[PDB]
Amino acid sequence: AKSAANKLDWAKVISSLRITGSTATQLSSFKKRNDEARRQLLELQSQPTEVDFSHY
Amino acid sequence: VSTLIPPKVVSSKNIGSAPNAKRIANVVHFYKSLPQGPAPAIKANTRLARYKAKYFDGDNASGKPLWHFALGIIAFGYSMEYYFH
């Protein structure tokens, strides 16, 4: 359900067309892009965080 | 690291920008102007205002009263001729 957040962010991108010279607002969206792109590879990267006592 | 906030800083912005002066100028320029040539008082009579209304407005504006005034001097000294010579 993150697409509503990002859809309203691109809505504010085509509305931040109206204010040229954005200092750090797009950089704040860059920081949420940074850790949101980090968290998905973090959750997909891991194994089930346990020692496999049956086989291993 | 945080939410930056320039979408809503138009509160103390709307004095500083340059067409604000023109906006506050012509909202003052437009209120007290009579709408469509109203309150014209197109007729006035003071025993000679009809002379101005027939001769000295923007519409007629022809040199004929000068002509009349020319004849006025023709009316003036010639009678003084009959008083002098």
Curated annotation (Swiss-Prot), chain A:
Q: Which subcellular locations apply to this protein?
A: Mitochondrion; Mitochondrion inner membrane
Subunit structure and binding partners: F-type ATPases have 2 components, CF(1) - the catalytic core - and CF(0) - the membrane proton channel. In yeast, the dimeric form of ATP synthase consists of 17 polypeptides: alpha, beta, gamma, delta, epsilon, 4 (B), 5 (OSCP), 6 (A), 8, 9 (C), d, E (Tim11), f, g, h, i/j and k.
What is this protein's function per UniProt? Mitochondrial membrane ATP synthase (F(1)F(0) ATP synthase or Complex V) produces ATP from ADP in the presence of a proton gradient across the membrane which is generated by electron transport complexes of the respiratory chain. F-type ATPases consist of two structural domains, F(1) - containing the extramembraneous catalytic core, and F(0) - containing the membrane proton channel, linked together by a central stalk and a peripheral stalk. During catalysis, ATP synthesis in the catalytic domain of F(1) is coupled via a rotary mechanism of the central stalk subunits to proton translocation.
Please give the family membership noted in the entry. Belongs to the ATPase d subunit family.
Q: Other comments?
A: Present with 6820 molecules/cell in log phase SD medium.
Q: Quote the protein name from its UniProt record.
A: ATP synthase subunit d, mitochondrial
Parent sequence residues shown: 4 to 59 of 174
Curated annotation (Swiss-Prot), chain B:
Q: Does the keyword Transport apply?
A: yes
Output a single Gene Ontology CC term carried by this record: mitochondrion
Question: What processes in GO biological process is this protein linked to?
Answer: proton motive force-driven ATP synthesis; proton transmembrane transport
Q: Which UniProt keywords apply?
A: ATP synthesis, CF(0), Hydrogen ion transport, Ion transport, Membrane, Mitochondrion, Mitochondrion inner membrane, Transit peptide, Transport
Chief subcellular location = mitochondrion
Query: So which domain of life are we looking at?
Result: Eukaryota
Q: Quote the subcellular location field of this record.
A: Mitochondrion; Mitochondrion inner membrane
Keyword Glycoprotein listed? The answer is: no
Q: What family does this belong to?
A: Belongs to the ATPase F chain family.
Its quaternary structure?
F-type ATPases have 2 components, CF(1) - the catalytic core - and CF(0) - the membrane proton channel. In yeast, the dimeric form of ATP synthase consists of 17 polypeptides: alpha, beta, gamma, delta, epsilon, 4 (B), 5 (OSCP), 6 (A), 8, 9 (C), d, E (Tim11), f, g, h, i/j and k.
Instruction: Give the protein's function.
Output: Mitochondrial membrane ATP synthase (F(1)F(0) ATP synthase or Complex V) produces ATP from ADP in the presence of a proton gradient across the membrane which is generated by electron transport complexes of the respiratory chain. F-type ATPases consist of two structural domains, F(1) - containing the extramembraneous catalytic core and F(0) - containing the membrane proton channel, linked together by a central stalk and a peripheral stalk. During catalysis, ATP synthesis in the catalytic domain of F(1) is coupled via a rotary mechanism of the central stalk subunits to proton translocation.
The miscellaneous annotation reads: Present with 14600 molecules/cell in log phase SD medium.
Name of the molecule in the record:
ATP synthase subunit f, mitochondrial
| Residues of the whole record sequence present | 7 to 91 of 101
